[PDB]
Symmetry: C2
Subunit: 195 residues, 2 copies
């Protein structure tokens, strides 16, 4: 049964991937995307996230449902997962460069925390447990605004993580579907990161 | 096994839905979204489309795989499906208005035709048969650019459907990930529509 719950919601994609998909053999592309998605899946499991879906190279993970550590630990877990994924991308790039893939590929991420609706949604032979709401769309918009290599979070997320994860103010951006400007921050790796 | 194939790719979403998701009881929201997705699914089956996935109220359908009618009939089928969905939305709105949902809700759609990579993509316990590529992203971008109630298509799609479906030039738009401007058209219902 569908509920309204405070979640931290994470989106990511690989900048450079679409270009890569127009020049790799289909089999090498399949293996590179699936390797990536499998490695990202393992990191999301480690950090306690709920993997929602993949849309090509786009990954959506949420924290706070079906279980929760409370809003602060859920947010710390989501951002720490992103820190960890960005570090693991360096490893994957080294592996890829060894297969002769040279074109640059970099993860970007958007994270927001707020109340979301969670439930089973879909058509009768095509149902999924997933989330919807403005706060879900705000995570997606942060991801769209982020630069290669950047993890962008909203002020609500920052408020939760600021004593334990190092951030830097990146101003306020124009987000379509958002009249008012939303405060954003970059997440910066530091000595006390959880991993 | 993964292949490169000429597909027509369709995306849609409901303008107004995100606002609605922030004010409807979760159970009424669930029933309204699932009714919508089930009705859209039935129309895509009727027209021969392959339903890829739903992402909240966003629907993705493609034509040309696993089977094909040839590039022209695949494109005519995808646009005719969109015409039909836009007509059925009038019915759904009348039903919704009778439950006291008054806020405006309107479908928008983007359609493009071109070579795409199709295959099984994902992590080991989370695999899906789906499509990727620049031409898939161009359909998504047309959908993002479309206005409520509009079906926007690219020139490649228009080239295929122009003798049987009535269109109007809507200029060229700025599409992120696209340097050059892409030619776009609105699809206009007319007497000879297939349904």
């Amino acid at each position: 049964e569908t509920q309204r719950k405070k979640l931290t919601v994470f989106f990511s994609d690989i900048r450079g991937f679409t270009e890569l998909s127009e020049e790799l053999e289909a089999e090498a592309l399949t293996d590179l995307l699936n390797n990536y998605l499998n490695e990202m899946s393992k990191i999301a499991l480690k950090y306690g996230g709920t993997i929602d879906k993949f849309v090509g190279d786009c990954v959506m993970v949420f924290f706070g449902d079906p279980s929760t550590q409370g809003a602060k630990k859920d947010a710390v877990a989501a951002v720490s997962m992103g820190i960890a994924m960005r570090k693991h991308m360096k490893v994957l790039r080294q592996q890829w460069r060894a297969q002769g893939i040279t074109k640059p590929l970099e993860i970007r991420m958007g994270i927001n925390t707020g109340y979301c609706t969670v439930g089973n949604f879909g058509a009768d032979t095509r149902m999924d447990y997933t989330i919807i709401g403005r706060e879900v769309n705000l995570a997606s918009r942060l991801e769209s605004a982020s630069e290669a290599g950047e993890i962008l979070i909203s002020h609500e997320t920052y408020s939760l993580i600021k004593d334990v994860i190092m951030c830097r103010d990146k101003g306020q951006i124009a987000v379509k579907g958002f009249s008012r400007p939303v405060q954003i921050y970059q997440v910066v790796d530091s000595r006390r990161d959880l991993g």
